[PDB]
Design a protein around this ligand. Structure first.
Ligand SMILES: Nc1ncnc2c1ncn2[C@@H]1O[C@H](COP(=O)(O)OP(=O)(O)OP(=O)(O)O)[C@@H](O)[C@H]1O
Ligand SMILES: Nc1ncnc2c1ncn2[C@@H]1O[C@H](COP(=O)(O)OP(=O)(O)OP(=O)(O)O)[C@@H](O)[C@H]1O
Ligand SMILES: Nc1ncnc2c1ncn2[C@@H]1O[C@H](COP(=O)(O)OP(=O)(O)O)[C@@H](O)[C@H]1O
Lengths: 528, 520, 539
């Protein structure tokens, strides 16, 4: 049924696999020249929903329907556990011996953590016995060739470390959340055999909003979209116990269905945690997207790992601006979001202090150690000008002598924001961001063009929908009287006009809100 | 087929083993002259992969090969369990007679975790009875020769504590991860019989870069490298069909294949210099090590070394790499000595312990393993980061250390020796050899720092030499940070002009970018 | 076994019986009348009524023979009434902070102890079982189980520990642990007895004078160090004699007549090891090293003579009144580095407690007010004793306002005629110390000693047996024997103002040259090097 085509995105855990399963059968001489004794054990692991059981399934299908003949034995967590006194460790050896007669064969253990927990003398003796009789008869597996043992898990730390050793489980595969190049393939696989195949550009657009999703999260919106189309088209289905008469020809899926379905959906990875990076909303985007792009260009100039081998030496950048220019609230999370596939580690006040029972120094050390472990990563310290005059005198020392110990050309990025200009910051901070290296970005107010696009939809498209030159003058005067607002005032004059419009929904004729609009625009006052 | 020469690294474990288990059994008339009384139980323990069963197999084969004067009973100590009422405890009482009729004997118990676990209200009636008979066949049916029992394990606490008592399993052998020297002979052993004989410099460098590996990993990187050659040489091996025609002579393993397999696999205040920085600071590291030799000669009667309160302080302006590159490279070169760090993120990066208590145990453990090193980097900020009790503890602690005990105190500083507080100034004695002032590198070094880039990669498929000269003409007073920053900036253009056959166009951009690199 | 627990006794070796224990003679003459006599003569303990105690506590540094005495004692009781059982538990073994396993383990252990009867229970390292309700549930049951042994028994409990102050004070009450025994590092006359015990069953028995010589060269050893150097001096002889046995698995023929042990096999064993007094205990008292002896032995003898004026127990109806002494000197005259520890070590048989910085704060991360009270109370409990406060000129400027108030009032609650000495050292002169410190030493009472530099002769003899003999050792041809003496005199003249930290550095910098010229058969390329290193040595 399913055989690799469906498996979209991974494409390298698959090539790395047939050199364990297929090659020792086909080319058993290259392993003799170097005396290789090829590997015999994988260990799939990663967050939930990201593949690896789809992979086990597709591999079983390739074996059963490919080049005869390979056997496939599958165990589900802990099945050897039996009621009598010895029938537990006997079934394991029975399985390994039956797999030797049907060889070549591959053994698959789903959800290891119920079978091989970390041994301890404060637990059941049967678990230690099972782990021992499992790492015994797997060590004596060289003479019993043509057997491959795979095990998929979720908790790599909950597996006995005596098994994660070359000889028992020598390869370890990481199944991570897809990125915008893989989510598009997945969406192509799931909307594959649809009546009116969704345009490639449409899926290209859909793959962007789905940031925290996985294969299981993407498979489900393709179903919620159809379920939304069904009740959009035929609303006379819920208010009925009997059947109806459908034509199955009027039911078509549109982008509104996908968006209303994505409204209800919550990614399985963000059901109990919130990531420190968001995107510009549909409102603020025509106001700051170009600024985001310029920031990314400068970051490329200083952090070329974001585009034979990129050379980077301690990449840092500091986004500076006036207190309302939107750098710690709008710009920096958007920059974090546009740079996906880099793990992000946050160091702001509610992280050092918003978690007690652990001094700030501990968490400050853990963040940098883990960011070193998996490079290239980002360490996000927003609002340093307040961060600095809120911490202790030893935390400054720890923070400065912990990122001086980072290898120079290791690609770890330090991102920070500021409200005071660079000159006003404490001189100890100014030593970290040098201007001649291109590590300081100064945000500026948006130009006339931007401010025009920001209001160009409210006037004149929303103020013309029932249940023109007089509107263009309103647009002109709004853009003129707002040429020196920050972001927090622009997107308030927006809301002020937004509310005005909403209060005239069922009014069948205009020229009651037009003058109301212009009066509310005239009463607006702030001036920083 | 394994007899002691297939074990790299454990040159002291093997000697102690045959000086305590083998020789009292082979030459009983010798150890009776002195009443040495060998043990009746030892125990190997350590992390997984460190050669615990390899030593057992080697010892068995060295007990068989010869004249068979000693018998070896090898028993994986978990398959001795019978799902019955009294049979597993009879195999034990039989194993001990089968080895008393053939004395001398060594009874080996591989993985005794599964034979004698900790009995409590989570154990069965079979394992408790097994322990009760095992610690009766040993304390009673022994103490005269010539049976010696060994057992292997990973955690020393996964065994019943009643077995480790005076008169029972008492001696212990800690198998730990290999250091940089053992990791070289391990690679030699695992590349013993090879077509293309590898060089010794290659294995040396590899052993340097394979940090954190434990033996078995080193056997694995050899395999994963040969899998990187094949894919490099026959990219058509995948998505194909049955073999047809393949030559097993163009699969030569190259040096860049080890560095890919070492990243397709998953595996301290001391780090060697990178390949890029080495030809810039290796000379200074040599000079520092020589000054150490001057003060630390370990790196009644005379004609053995003798030192007096070894102390050295590498001083240099900020940016001279005296605490970023130099001192950890020197700690690396001075391996085979145990190092103990004392800096900020190790005094304060842990709670549930005082900074005054984590400073006394460090000096205690440094005295127990002398000659050792105590490493305090950046004293010019270390001194103003601790409390007034920690200073008065640290000073009296390193004062109570005996006069001639070879504990070295290594430290660094960015402010000059005359800008430090008096309490520190009266701790190094510049009139002695205890202060070392770093200098900028010489023209010879600086020039050779850029040569692979200019001119051996901008011309990689001339006027470059001129540009090269200019690179040395403005970099005269650059510290290490600006130096390697300028080197990384000049290595960027090249990576941007990868697929540009026509030259003289990236040379112009290069000479204008190096004309713009300002680092005042 | 229906009791899934560690309750089995041990089969002890029968060859340990009041003959292998060397150095511990007062303790044995007391344990054999509270453990042995109630079992051997049971008619005196019923003639009147006695019901002897059921408890002993052993404490002291590690390796001092505290398990060995329990073993010897269990073998000594079970010689007429075979046989006394022996149970041994060791605190902190995979049962700490596990409720409620430890309670039933202890209950079953006491049950088994009752079933055998007579028996001896031994808790090695109780610090892991009753350290100062995971904690109350287990100590309360231990107290109830111990306090429930009938007066005659016959069950005897014994406990061992390293620091007496890491044990719950609820244990030290009569009927449970009514006596305590201190196992200290052995002096010379006990070191000789241990050496005679361990080298007793040898064909070619070592000479008595050689054992006398050995007992003095290994100071700071604890029992197990002597065992380790005796059993390793036997391996060096074999290794040096037959080095071709290490590369041959085939048992070759060896003559058991050329493997006789000699010296230079004991000292090569004593080289590669570090003693007990330099490993763990932070023993405040250490004797002068063999290098510094000829320089400071006279000062050490002078202090111990101005110390019997105040502390007339330093010559053992003596009567003293608040014995105090303060040795003062310049910063480098070695009062807190060489003199005071050697003075303390000379005063063995007197228990010594220290109050210095790494003990108040570093060790035992508790409040520094309870540790000072502990040391004062236990110092007067075992008087005559010593309290040692080194470097008061800095000690006083590091403690809090409450610690001074506790210390100054705790040494006035000591009875006036108790022999509890207070020894302190300083680097500022007496009149530079804070006034609360000056109001403790009354120099007209003789409580002050001023250290001075070593005399000309002292320095001469200090450099002599380095610069005349070791500078002419045949590398195993031509030595001058005349300019060596001139160099000795120039060195003695040049160094007539150094303190000790410099006087003993100019001794290590001159000995280095000799090492760099080990093999040179012409002893001339280092004489000039010697005198040019001395010509460039500045304070
Ligand atoms: N890379 C992918 N391409 C296509 N579909 C996918 C992919 N990953 C997941 N899916 C879909 O999501 C479903 C769940 O996948 P799967 O069960 O393999 O995840 P998992 O890692 O095994 O989850 P868990 O670890 O919780 O068991 C699959 O049935 C598959 O239809
Ligand atoms: N010191 C060493 N020298 C050479 N090879 C080694 C060494 N240590 C390990 N190896 C290689 O790694 C393999 C695994 O080592 P080994 O099984 O002896 O240790 P182990 O896994 O701790 O043993 P066990 O865990 O089964 O008791 C060996 O077959 C050997 O080839
Ligand atoms: N006083 C002593 N006399 C003879 N041998 C001793 C003495 N003290 C220690 N030893 C030797 O040291 C070994 C270990 O001593 P041990 O009793 O374990 O010390 P601890 O008191 O710390 O338990 C003993 O087996 C014995 O061989």
């Amino acid at each position: 049924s399913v055989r690799f085509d469906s498996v979209g995105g991974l494409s390298n855990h698959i090539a790395a696999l047939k050199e364990m399963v297929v090659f020792p059968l086909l080319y058993p001489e290259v392993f003799e020249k170097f005396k290789i004794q090829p590997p015999r054990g994988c260990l799939f692991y990663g967050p939930p929903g990201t593949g690896k059981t789809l992979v086990a399934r597709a591999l079983a299908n390739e074996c059963s329907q490919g080049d005869k003949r390979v056997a496939f034995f599958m165990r589900k967590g802990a099945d050897c556990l039996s009621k009598w006194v010895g029938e537990s460790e006997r079934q394991l050896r029975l399985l390994f011996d039956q797999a030797y007669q049907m060889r070549p064969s591959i053994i698959f253990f789903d959800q290891i953590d119920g079978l091989a927990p970390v041994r301890s003398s404060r637990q059941d003796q049967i678990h230690s016995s099972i782990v021992s009789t499992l790492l015994a008869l797997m060590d004596g597996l060289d003479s019993r060739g043509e057997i491959v043992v795979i095990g998929a898990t979720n908790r790599l730390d909950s597996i006995d470390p005596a098994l994660r050793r070359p000889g028992r489980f020598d390869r370890e595969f990481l199944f991570s959340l897809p990125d915008k190049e893989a989510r598009k393939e997945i969406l192509k696989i799931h909307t594959r055999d649809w009546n009116p195949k969704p345009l490639d550009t449409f899926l290209e657009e859909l793959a962007e909003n789905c940031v925290g999703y996985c294969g299981a999260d993407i498979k489900s919106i393709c179903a919620e979209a159809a379920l939304c189309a069904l009740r959009r088209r035929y609303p006379q289905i819920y208010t009925t116990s009997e059947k109806l008469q459908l034509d199955l020809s009027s039911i078509n899926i549109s982008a509104k269905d996908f968006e209303v379905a994505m409204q209800k959906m919550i990614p399985a990875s963000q059901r109990a945690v919130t990531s420190p990076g968001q995107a510009l909303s549909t409102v603020v985007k025509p106001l700051l997207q170009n600024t985001v792009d310029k920031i990314l260009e400068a970051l490329q100039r200083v952090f070329p790992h974001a585009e034979y081998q990129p050379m980077s030496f301690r990449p840092r950048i500091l986004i500076v601006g006036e207190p309302g220019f939107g750098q710690g609230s709008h710009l920096a999370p958007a920059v974090i979001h546009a740079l996906e596939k880099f793990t992000v580690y946050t160091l702001d006040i509610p992280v050092l202090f918003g978690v007690s029972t652990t001094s700030p120094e501990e968490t400050c050390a853990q963040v940098i150690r883990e960011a070193k472990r998996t490079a290239p990563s980002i360490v996000y310290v927003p609002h340093i000008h307040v961060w600095w005059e809120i911490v202790g005198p030893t935390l400054k020392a720890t923070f400065t002598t912990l990122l001086q110990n980072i290898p120079s050309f290791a690609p770890v990025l330090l991102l920070a924001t500021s409200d005071k200009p660079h000159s006003a910051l404490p001189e100890e901070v100014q030593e970290l961001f040098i201007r001649d290296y291109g590590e300081i970005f100064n945000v500026q107010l948006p130009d006339k063009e931007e401010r025009t696009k920001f209001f160009e939809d409210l006037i004149l498209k929303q103020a013309a929908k029932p249940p023109h030159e007089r509107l263009k003058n309103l647009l002109k005067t709004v853009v003129k009287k707002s040429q020196n607002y920050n972001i927090f005032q622009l997107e308030n004059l927006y809301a002020v006009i937004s509310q005005c419009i909403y209060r005239h929904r069922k009014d069948h004729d205009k020229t009651s809100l037009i003058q109301k609009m212009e009066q509310e625009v005239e009463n607006f006052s702030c001036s920083r």
